[PDB]
Amino acid sequence: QSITAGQKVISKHKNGRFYQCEVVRLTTETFYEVNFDDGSFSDNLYPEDIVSQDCLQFGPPAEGEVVQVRWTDGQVYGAKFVASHPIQMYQVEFEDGSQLVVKRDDVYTLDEELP
Template identity: 80%
Template sequence: MKKASGCCVQCSHGRCPTAYHPTCAQAAGVLMQPDEWPFVVHVTCCRHKAAMHELTVGQKVICKHKNGRYYQCDVVQLSKETFYEVNFDDGSFSDNLFPEDIVVDCAQLGPPPQGEVVQVRWTDGLVYGAKFVAAHVIQMYLVEFEDGSQLTAKRDDVYSLDEELPKRVKSRLVRREIIQESKRQRVINSRYRGDYIEPVIYRAIME
């Protein structure tokens, strides 16, 4: 039966928009595990369960360009980045803070103990109170686009060519075949080839 209501749970990997009804997720074999506040439950959608293998240097992938469109590009470098996770006093949280976003010198002292009260310098320049949750070491990928520009992204933001793309990515994907088609040289129909005049000759006649 089609119902107009029902709670959905969203995939916990990055900003993945995939969401399921809990009973549908169980029937589909989606991984669901208890998690700590504020997550309550950790969900791994089918895409991240089946296709989240590590990428290698030289591999062709799909990633978001700075212009907001998705293009095919190449992985040119692998690196590790440390991100801090905190729970803010207002109930919100962030899991992608840099160590330098914490007011204390974490570069020298290391990450704070779990549950310790910290001060976080946010992007608006203000300082907010929070509790430290954990430090996560994430694999990062430096990709290079055809225009020579480069971008560093997490695995959740990079798609291999054999992965299923979300609808939001498909709608913004610029395919190489389309670009090549727009640059293909026009060919004169053989039926009218005898009537065709080269542009240089045409300009000379007109002059």
């Protein structure tokens, strides 16, 4: 059930197909959740996407605090900080040398059926 570093596993390569790969490191990804001024919700912002303050250096903003965020479209939107949640993830390396940082549910042991 538990996946550890150095373990050979099976996961989807960037080309979309499953291949054996090796977990080279267990990382911790911190995602920010915010409510945009129009009411829409985002649950996967990175600390760096907050452009109204420097979260990478001083931590997440306070609950409900007003912030500006740089969205995936390169634009800046006003919003309110909701919460922060660190997620344990897996950095995997395939035979060709490419790597990906994936979630637990995207990793499989050699003995289990796919998908």
